[PDB]
Design a protein around this ligand. Structure first.
Ligand SMILES: [Zn+2]
Ligand SMILES: [Zn+2]
Ligand SMILES: [Zn+2]
Ligand SMILES: [Zn+2]
Ligand SMILES: [Zn+2]
Ligand SMILES: [Zn+2]
Lengths: 187, 586, 585
RNA sequence: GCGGUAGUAGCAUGCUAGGGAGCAG
RNA sequence: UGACUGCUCCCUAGCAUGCUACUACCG
C-alpha cells in the first residue's frame, strides 16, 4: 500500500485530525477533524479494492502461461518419439522381397495380411500340447505357407530353453506346455 | 519459448521481434532493448497485440494487460494493468530477473544498419555472447539482403555452351563471379527438382563446373539461401600453460622431414592454442603434415572452407601417404572420392565446413581462417569441438567477401577475433624459410611490415619486369570494360617467347572473360587459388580504382610465378621506394 | 517416515533437508538449526515447497500452510499461518516436544569438514547414541565425499606389462590404494564383467594379480553402499553376574599355563572386560583354551579381515575337529578352505561384512582397531552375547582419519575404549610373552603399558641400530631416499642369512622400484593381521609428519621372535632402549 | 424520524472447476 | 497392464443472489 497514489491524502487527513486532538478543538473545526479523514478513507479503500483485483487477475496469467509452455514442450517430446519409431520400424523391410510383390501387383495395392506371410524372415509357432506338436513342427525342418522353415530355438512358457529331445511322448508331462518354436526361412 | 537471455542466460520466456532472428531477451533486459529503440513488438508464450477486433496497436510498452488478453489503451478493460512498468515486461520467471548492464553494446548492435566500418568496429568490441549474437545477425542481414532477387525462366535451349537467360522485371542481374555458387532448384509440377551446381560467364559461355542436366522447358534458376541455424557453442576458450604431456607420444625416431619443426613442437605443444603465422610459400601447406606424422598417437583432423584449394594437401598425400589410412566425407557437396567415405573412425580426417559429424578430437587444423567469418569458426567449433586447433592462414592476405561494406577498407585486425587477439598479446611464432620461392617476396614483405626480420635467401637476378603504363578506365553498364587492356596484353606478348605458356589472373572476371572471348586465356581465381600458383605468370593491370587494389591485395598476387614475374604497375602502388628492371616497349 | 530425534529422545517426523544424513530433528532442534545455520529446508511426509506452477521459492522460512499445501509470500494466497512460529516448526508431534540445551550441535558439525579436533573432543564427551550417530555421520560423510573423486579408464589395449593410464585434469589425486579399484567395464552401451585389478607400480609398468582380458574403453570407479541404522549400544554398564551358573565346565585343565584357572574363574564372575594387548597377547592360543574348556559355550570368532581369522584357522583344525568353524563367503581377500554355506554350529565364526543373526553366548573378537565405534555397534547388534572378553587393543592399527589438516590427536583421547580404561583402571591380567622377545616388550611396557608384561625370554644381541641422519630430497610429486636404503643394504651383506625375508615399506612405489634390482616380493603396509615371521626390513618416512608423529607402530613392532630391525632418526625412543649401537664403515 | 449509494465481516442456497471414493450395465 | 457412459455421497478454492450489524458521504 506504500505506492498507492491515494496514500498522501489519507496520511495528511489522519495527521490533521488525529494528531490535533490534544489541542483545543471547537465544534466547528471538529467537522474538519471528522469529515477530512472520512471520504479520503473511502477512496483509499476504493484504491485498495481495485489493486487487490488487479493483483489476482495478474496472478492468473502467470499460471495459465506456464501451462501453455509446459504443453508445447511436451508436444515436442511426443512429436519426436513417434518420428523415432516410424523410422526404426522402417529400417527393417528386406527391400528385395517386398519390392517383388508391390511390383507384381496390378496397381501396387496388396492386402496387408499377406505381407508378413510372404516377406518375413522369422516364424513363431505357439503349441499347446504334444499331439499338436507332431502334426505341425516335427523334426528340425517343416513346411508352412508354401515354404520351408528350419527350427532355431524352442523356449517354453517360463522362457527356458528346451531341446528337441526333451519333447517325448512321455516326458511331455514335465514341460511348461505353451511351447514357442522360432524358425528361420530356408533358401 | 523459455531459455537463456542472450545476455544473462537466466531463463526467460520473452523474445523481441525487431531482432529478426528473435533472441530470448530476458525480462528486465527487454525494458532496455524495447524502449531504448524502435524495437517494440514482443512475443512470449503468447503474442502481444491488442486482441481487440482487428486492431493494429502493438509496441507493448504502450499495450496494457487485463482480462486474459492484452490491450494497450485501445480498449483497456476496467481492470487493466500496464504490461510495461517497473523495469520489466510481464513474463514467465520474474524473480530470476536480473538483466545486466549490457544493453550498451546490445543497443548499438541492435541499431546498426551495417553500412559503415563503425558497424564492424563496435561489433568487434563486446563480450563472447554479444560477439555470437552480432555474427549471427550479420550473417542474417547479409543473406536476407542477398536473396532479394527474382527467378530466371527458361523454356528452350539451342545447344551446349549457349543459353538465352533473362532476369525478371525490376530485378538486376546477379553478380558475375562464382563467389555465390548458383545452386538452383527448378520445378516440375509441385516440388523442387535438382538442377546442379552452376555459374555464369557473360551476358562464349563456358561452363567451368562438373555436371550436366537436361535443361529445357519450365526451368527456374534461383539462388538458394539456406536457413541458418542458431549458434550455441563458443568460438574459443582461454588457455593455460601446463607442464605434463598427457596422452601425446613423441616418436622413438626422428622424422627429419624439416629442420625448424623441432621448435614448432617445442613452442606449440605447451599452450592450449596457437596459430601457424607463416608467410606465403614458407611452409603454410605442409607443416601440419609433419605434425601429423610426428604425433601418430594423437587424434588429428583437418577442416577446410573451399573446394578448390585441395591440390597441395592431395598431391603429397598420394606421393608419400596411404589411401585407406586417410578418410574423406562427401554427401549425395561434390568433390574427389579417392579415399574412404563414411568412416567415423580414422586418424587423418579431411572435411569441409558444409557438414561434419558430431565428434570430439584433440588436434585440428583449420585452413584459410582469413577467408572465414567468426560465424565459421563458431560453427566449426560447435559441430566439432576438440581440445586443440591451429588456424592455418595469415592476416596479411585478402579480406573475406563482405559485399556489405564498400566505402571503407577492411583492416586485418578487424577480420576476426583471432586476427587481433594474436596482434595484441603477440604472435605465437614467425617463419622465414620459403621452401620454393625467390627472395623478391622476402625483401618486399620484410620492407613492408616485417621490419626486415627475415633476409633474402635466393639471389635477386633482377628478372622482374615493370613498366610505366597506367591505362584508362571507363564504366558503361553493370559489367565493366577496359579498352587499354585488349591491346596492352597484345603489346606485351609481341616479342616475348618466355610467357607463351603462361596463365592469366582474374581480379575482375568480367574483363578476363571479355579478353578470353577476344583472344582466349584460361581463367584462374584470385581468392580461392592459394597454393595453386603456376611457375610462369603475368600480372595484368585490370583495374584503376580503389575497389580492390588499395593496400592488401597484391602481396599474394606478386608471388604467383616462380622464375618469371612480370608485374606491371597499375596505380600509385609502391613505385618510388625501390628499383625495378624495365623492358623498353617498342 | 516416523523416526526419532535422539538429540532429545523425542519421537518426531521431520528431518533437516540440506544436511549430511538428513536425520530426525524435533520441533525444537529443527527450529534453531534453520535460523542460524542456513539449512533453509526441512523434509516431512511431503517436502516443504511451494505448490504452484513454476514457483522457485522453497524455503520453509515464512511459508504459509493453507488449502492443503504450502504456499509462499511473494505471490500471496496468505489466508493462513506461517510454518515457523512460536519457537517450533509445524509437523506431527507438535505438542510432545522436549527440546535440547546444546543448541550448536549441527551449527558446529553440519558445516565443518568433519575433521576438526574440537568436534572430535566434544564428541568424546557425549552420550552413547549421540556418538553412534556421530560415527554414522562420519561414515556418511566419507561415502558422500566418495562420489566427488576421479575415475580411471582404458581406451587403448596395449601389450601386457606396458600400458598407460590418465586419471584427471585440473582438480585437487593421492590415494594409498588401501581398498582397491573394482569398477565394471563397458563395451558399447551395456555393462561387461571385468573383475578386480590392482595398480601398484607406475611407459607405465603393470603387474598382474590374476589373469584377465582387457577390452577397449573399460572404466573403473567405486560404488559404496550406505551404512544402515543400527539399534544397539557400544559399551555396557558394569554388573557382576550372580555366579558361574548356567555353564558346563570341564574336568580337565591345562598345565602349561600358570594363569588359566584364575582367569577362567574371573571371566566366570565378571561380565565385560577390556585390555590393551599387543600382537601375541592371548589372541594366538587362548581362544582354543576357552574353546576346549567351555564346550557348550557359543563362542563367536571374528576379525576385521579373513586373514587374521586364517591365523587361528590354520592350526584350529589339527587339535580340534575341522567342522568346528564356519564362515560364509560372498558371491577383501579370502580362500575357500572351510565348509561354506553352513551357518549352524557351536563355534560359529563371523565376519564384519555380513552374517545372519541366530544366537551367541560369548563375545571374543580379534583386533578391532581399524574402525570407529561402528565395529563395536555392528557386532553388538548382530549378536548379543552374555559375556564380553574384548581381545586385542583399541590403538593397534587405527583407521586413517581420512583427510588430516590439523595434526594428530593424542591417543589418550580415543572414541570410547581408551579413555575409559585409563580413567578407571585395567580389569583383567593377560599376557603371552612366548613369541615376542623382551627387547620390544621392555620399551613397549615402558611407554604406555607400564607394569603389564614381564621380560621372560632373553635377547641374542641381534638388533640393528645405527644413528644416521641422512639427507631428504623432495620433488614435485614424490621423493626417493638414497642414504638409508643403501646403508641398510650394506649392513645386510655382512650376514649370510638375509635373503629369506620380505620387502615391506611405508610406501609401495619405493620398495617396488627397489625390488627390480634385488629381486624381492612386493609388500605394503595396511595390516599385518596374524602374520608373524622372523626376518623383516622396516622403514618409515616421511617421518616428520607421516611417520614421526606419534607411536602409531609401537604394537606393530612385535612380529619377530628373536629380533627385529627398526631404524629411527629421533632421540625419544632410544633414551633407555638398548639396541646394539655400531658405527658405519 | 426514513430512503439510496460504496466498502467490510458473518450465516445458507444454486452453478461452474479440481481431488479422493461407491455402485450399475 | 487399468475402456466407454450414467448416477450419487464427502472435502477445498472462486463467482452472483438472499435477511442483518459496522463503517462513511449523501440526501
Ligand atoms: Zn527487438
Ligand atoms: Zn485496439
Ligand atoms: Zn537479461
Ligand atoms: Zn541440516
Ligand atoms: Zn529435538
Ligand atoms: Zn507460490
Amino acid at each position: 500500500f506504500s505506492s498507492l497514489p491515494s496514500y498522501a491524502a489519507f496520511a495528511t487527513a489522519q495527521e490533521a485530525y488525529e494528531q490535533a486532538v490534544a489541542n483545543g478543538d471547537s465544534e466547528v473545526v471538529l467537522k474538519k477533524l471528522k469529515k477530512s479523514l472520512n471520504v479520503a478513507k473511502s477512496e483509499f479503500d476504493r484504491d485498495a479494492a481495485m489493486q487487490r483485483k488487479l493483483e489476482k487477475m495478474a496472478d492468473q496469467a502467470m499460471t495459465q502461461m506456464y501451462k501453455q509452455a509446459r504443453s508445447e514442450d511436451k508436444r515436442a517430446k511426443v512429436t519426436s518419439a513417434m518420428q523415432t519409431m516410424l523410422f526404426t520400424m522402417l529400417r527393417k523391410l528386406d527391400n528385395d522381397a517386398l519390392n517383388n510383390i508391390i511390383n507384381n501387383a496390378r496397381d501396387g495395392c496388396v492386402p496387408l495380411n499377406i505381407i508378413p506371410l510372404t516377406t518375413a524372415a522369422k516364424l513363431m509357432v505357439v503349441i499347446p500340447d504334444y499331439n499338436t506338436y507332431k502334426n505341425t513342427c516335427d523334426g528340425t525342418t517343416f513346411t508352412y505357407a508354401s515354404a520351408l522353415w528350419e527350427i532355431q530355438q524352442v523356449v517354453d512358457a517360463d522362457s527356458k530353453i528346451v531341446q528337441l529331445s526333451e519333447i517325448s511322448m512321455d516326458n511331455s508331462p514335465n514341460l511348461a506346455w505353451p511351447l514357442i518354436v522360432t524358425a528361420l526361412r530356408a533358401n | 519459448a523459455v531459455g537463456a537471455c542472450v545476455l544473462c542466460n537466466s531463463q526467460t520466456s520473452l523474445r523481441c521481434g525487431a531482432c529478426i532472428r528473435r533472441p530470448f531477451l530476458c525480462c528486465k533486459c527487454c525494458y532496455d532493448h524495447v524502449i531504448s529503440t524502435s524495437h517494440k513488438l514482443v512475443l512470449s508464450v503468447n503474442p502481444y497485440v491488442c486482441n481487440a477486433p482487428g486492431c493494429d496497436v502493438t509496441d507493448v510498452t504502450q499495450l496494457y494487460l487485463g482480462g486474459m488478453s492484452y490491450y494497450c489503451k485501445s480498449h483497456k478493460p476496467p481492470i487493466s494493468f500496464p504490461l510495461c512498468a517497473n523495469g520489466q515486461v510481464f513474463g514467465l520467471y520474474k524473480n530470476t530477473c536480473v538483466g545486466s548492464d549490457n544493453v550498451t553494446d546490445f543497443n548499438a548492435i541492435a541499431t546498426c544498419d551495417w553500412t559503415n566500418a563503425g558497424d564492424y568496429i563496435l561489433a568487434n568490441t563486446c563480450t563472447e555472447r554479444l560477439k555470437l549474437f552480432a555474427a549471427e545477425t550479420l550473417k542474417a542481414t547479409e543473406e536476407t539482403f542477398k536473396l532479394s532477387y527474382g527467378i530466371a525462366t527458361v523454356r528452350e535451349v539451342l545447344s551446349d555452351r549457349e543459353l538465352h537467360l533473362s532476369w525478371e522485371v525490376g530485378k538486376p542481374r546477379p553478380p558475375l563471379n562464382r563467389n555465390y555458387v548458383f545452386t538452383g532448384y527448378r520445378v516440375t509440377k509441385n516440388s523442387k527438382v535438382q538442377i546442379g551446381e552452376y555459374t555464369f560467364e557473360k551476358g562464349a559461355v563456358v561452363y567451368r563446373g562438373t555436371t550436366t542436366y537436361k535443361l529445357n522447358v519450365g526451368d527456374y534458376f534461383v539462388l538458394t539461401s539456406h536457413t541458418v541455424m542458431p549458434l550455441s557453442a563458443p568460438t574459443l576458450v582461454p588457455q593455460e600453460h601446463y607442464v605434463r604431456i598427457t596422452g601425446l607420444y613423441p616418436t622413438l625416431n626422428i622424422s627429419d622431414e624439416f629442420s625448424s619443426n623441432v621448435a614448432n613442437y617445442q613452442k606449440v605443444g605447451m599452450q592450449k592454442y596457437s596459430t601457424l603465422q607463416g608467410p606465403p610459400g614458407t611452409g603454410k601447406s605442409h607443416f601440419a603434415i609433419g605434425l601429423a606424422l610426428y604425433y601418430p598417437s594423437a587424434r588429428i583432423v583437418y577442416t577446410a572452407c573451399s573446394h578448390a584449394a585441395v591440390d597441395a594437401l592431395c598431391e603429397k598425400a598420394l606421393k608419400y601417404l596411404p589411401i585407406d589410412k586417410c578418410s574423406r566425407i562427401i554427401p549425395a557437396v561434390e568433390c574427389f572420392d579417392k579415399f574412404k567415405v563414411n568412416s567415423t573412425l580414422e586418424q587423418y580426417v579431411f572435411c569441409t565446413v558444409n557438414a561434419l559429424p558430431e565428434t570430439t578430437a584433440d588436434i585440428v587444423v583449420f585452413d584459410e581462417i582469413s577467408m572465414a567469418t567468426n560465424y565459421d569458426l563458431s560453427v566449426v567449433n560447435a559441430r566439432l569441438r576438440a581440445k586443440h586447433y591451429v588456424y592455418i592462414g595469415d592476416p596479411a592476405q585478402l579480406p573475406a567477401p563482405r559485399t556489405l561494406l564498400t566505402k571503407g577498407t577492411l583492416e586485418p585486425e578487424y577480420f576476426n577475433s583471432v586476427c587481433r587477439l594474436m596482434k595484441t598479446i603477440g604472435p605465437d611464432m614467425f617463419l622465414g624459410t620459403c621452401r620454393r620461392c625467390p627472395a623478391e617476396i622476402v625483401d618486399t614483405v620484410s620492407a613492408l611490415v616485417y621490419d626486415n626480420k627475415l633476409k633474402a635467401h635466393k639471389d635477386k637476378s633482377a628478372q622482374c619486369f615493370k613498366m610505366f603504363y597506367k591505362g584508362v578506365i571507363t564504366h558503361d553498364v553493370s559489367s565493366a570494360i577496359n579498352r587499354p587492356q585488349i591491346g596492352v596484353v597484345r603489346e606485351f606478348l609481341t616479342r616475348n617467347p618466355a610467357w607463351r605458356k603462361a596463365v592469366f589472373i582474374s581480379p575482375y572476371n568480367s574483363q578476363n572473360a571479355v579478353a578470353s572471348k577476344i583472344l582466349g586465356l584460361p581463367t584462374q581465381t584470385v581468392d580461392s587459388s592459394q597454393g595453386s600458383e603456376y611457375d610462369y605468370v603475368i600480372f595484368t593491370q585490370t583495374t584503376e580504382t580503389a575497389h580492390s587494389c588499395n593496400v592488401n591485395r597484391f602481396n599474394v598476387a606478386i608471388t604467383r610465378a616462380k622464375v618469371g614475374i612480370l608485374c606491371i604497375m597499375s596505380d600509385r602502388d609502391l613505385y618510388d621506394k625501390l628499383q625495378f628492371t624495365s623492358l623498353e616497349i617498342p
